[PDB]
């Protein structure tokens, strides 16, 4: 399947 | 005016660096730090830099752009749809997985790209950049909008002037979450984004580093709050050029598309260096083209995405749970959980599906109501490790009794967390038939039904699955194995 999927806006830690 | 704003800064740096006042008051920190915040806004000039044109007015540059860096520009129109907002409209029939959308690496803005920028002085020397992507992100974005020859204007003069995220809710939008769990996310982000405003506030005016920046002339909080939700509503993971490691990036053109539900049709492509997306499903000539963001919960799409979606197939519900050190058997579960990869204690989700837990969760569940003898048939001898291997799996229970109580638990559980929330499920109903809400009154409300109902057909899941097997242990069932 994909092998780098791209996930649009994903989540990241802010603090 | 100039020391007047170094004041409150100063005055919302130490604010926000304390520590977290107990969750009690933590509405009241909340409002506080609020209050400080508009001050600090109702004292400045907005966004630093706002462009003359309408949104769609800048659409035809970025395609010109776009284009001339090797991107697809052919097959679809942007329109300004009323429930998403902008998004892509085909105008040609496009088949299901059709490759139709690719956008090569470098029109992209990353991290990388940041570091190579006019603010690689500044995060060569601040922690908080190099540790943190998605904050150097934000301040790419606002050192290249305050740039007018930058590469990147002609993305960044498309990109949306305001957003939904609970950072631009009133204050009273934001009380009808009291008493949930999304509420401490929605403190946590505006606690961080007042923090990192007024440390980065004083960090420009004191490093010299950061003495080219146009940030050095005017950095407001609305161009902080702005920064970070473009980030957070928009941004990606994608492999380095080496393709040795992950970075985060924004991607233009690519990111006008609105999600619906469905897989993941988005990929990169690291032999051509592009971001490449098939299509999910057919797209007719006028219809909108969508794409699956990807498998986050309803509390994630609100906070971090600015939006709420009905039927979120993924939905879920946080449950923190953990071994008590009170137990007699507690050095016994914690060892079978260690050896099973699990942590003692844990917050774990509860799914709106059947079963509402998931494999790591049940694992836990069943060791927290082992008794000592299946503990002990978990730790020795020749069969030890297949059990282990087992934990997860709903066709192998411990014990028809271990079933029945762990089944027993949850729908305890997750019936004295319904009894948390102030309003009820048929309450949140009637509030939202009966009254007319803004967008983001709608959001809230619904995220807090959402949480209830999650919990309601859990509660219902584990009592099926409690009869289930109390009737295979009064039949005296064998045991699959
Ligand atoms: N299914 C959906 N329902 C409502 N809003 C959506 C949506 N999918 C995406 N969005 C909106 O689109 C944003 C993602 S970027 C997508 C393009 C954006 N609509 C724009 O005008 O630039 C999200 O922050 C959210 O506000």
Not at chain 2, 74 to 82: A, I, L, P, S, T
Not at chain 2, 123 to 139: E, H, K, P
Not at chain 2, 201 to 221: E, G, M, R, W
Not at chain 2, 288 to 309: D, K, L, P
């Amino acid at each position: 399947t994909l092998k780098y999927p791209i996930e649009h806006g994903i989540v990241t830690n802010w603090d | 005016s100039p020391k007047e704003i170094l004041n409150l800064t100063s005055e919302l740096l130490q604010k926000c660096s304390s520590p977290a006042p107990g969750p009690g008051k933590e509405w009241e920190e909340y409002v506080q730090i609020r209050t400080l915040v508009e001050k600090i806004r109702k004292k400045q000039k907005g966004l630093s830099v706002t462009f003359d044109g309408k949104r769609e007015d800048y659409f035809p540059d970025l395609m010109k752009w776009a284009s001339e860096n090797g991107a697809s520009v052919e097959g679809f129109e942007m329109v300004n749809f009323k429930e998403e907002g902008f998004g892509l409209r085909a105008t040609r029939d496009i088949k299901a997985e059709e490759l139709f959308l690719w956008v090569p690496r470098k029109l992209l803005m990353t991290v990388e790209s940041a570091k190579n920028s006019v603010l690689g002085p500044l995060y060569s020397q601040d922690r908080i950049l190099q540790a943190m992507g998605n904050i150097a992100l934000a301040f790419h974005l606002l050192c290249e909008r305050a740039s007018p020859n930058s590469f990147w204007q002609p993305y960044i003069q498309t990109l949306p002037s305001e957003y939904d995220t609970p950072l631009y809710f009133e204050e009273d939008e934001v009380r009808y979450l009291q008493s949930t769990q999304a509420i401490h996310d929605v403190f946590s982000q505006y606690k961080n984004t007042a923090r990192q405003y007024a440390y980065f506030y004083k960090v420009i005016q004191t490093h010299p580093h950061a003495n080219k920046l146009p940030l050095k002339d005017s950095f407001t909080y609305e161009d902080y709050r702005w920064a970070v939700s473009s980030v957070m509503t928009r941004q990606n993971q994608i492999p380095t050029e080496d393709g040795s490691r992950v970075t985060l990036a924004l991607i233009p053109l690519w990111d006008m598309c609105n999600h619906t539900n469905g897989l993941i049709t988005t990929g990169y492509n690291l032999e051509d260096d592009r971001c490449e997306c098939v299509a999910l499903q057919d797209f007719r000539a006028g219809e909108q083209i969508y794409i699956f963001y990807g498998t986050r919960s309803n509390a994630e799409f609100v906070i971090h995405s600015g939006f709420f979606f009905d039927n979120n197939s993924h939905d879920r519900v946080k449950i923190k749970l953990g071994v008590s050190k009170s137990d007699r058997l507690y050095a016994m579960k914690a060892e079978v959980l260690a050896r099973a990869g699990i942590p003692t204690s844990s917050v774990f989700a509860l799914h709106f599906t059947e079963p509402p837990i998931s494999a790591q969760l049940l694992a836990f569940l069943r060791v927290f109501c082992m008794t000592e003898e299946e503990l002990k048939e978990h730790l020795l001898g020749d069969s030890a490790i297949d059990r282990i291997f087992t934990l997860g799996n709903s066709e192998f229970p411990v014990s028809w009794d271990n079933e029945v109580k762990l089944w027993t638990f949850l729908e305890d559980r997750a019936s004295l967390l319904l009894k948390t929330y102030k309003t009820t499920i048929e309450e949140d109903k009637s509030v939202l038939k009966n009254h007319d809400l803004s967008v983001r009154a709608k959001m809230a409300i619904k995220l807090r039904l959402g949480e209830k109902e999650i919990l309601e057909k859990a509660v219902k899941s584990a009592a099926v699955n409690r009869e289930y097997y109390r009737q295979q242990m009064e039949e005296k069932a064998p045991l699959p194995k």
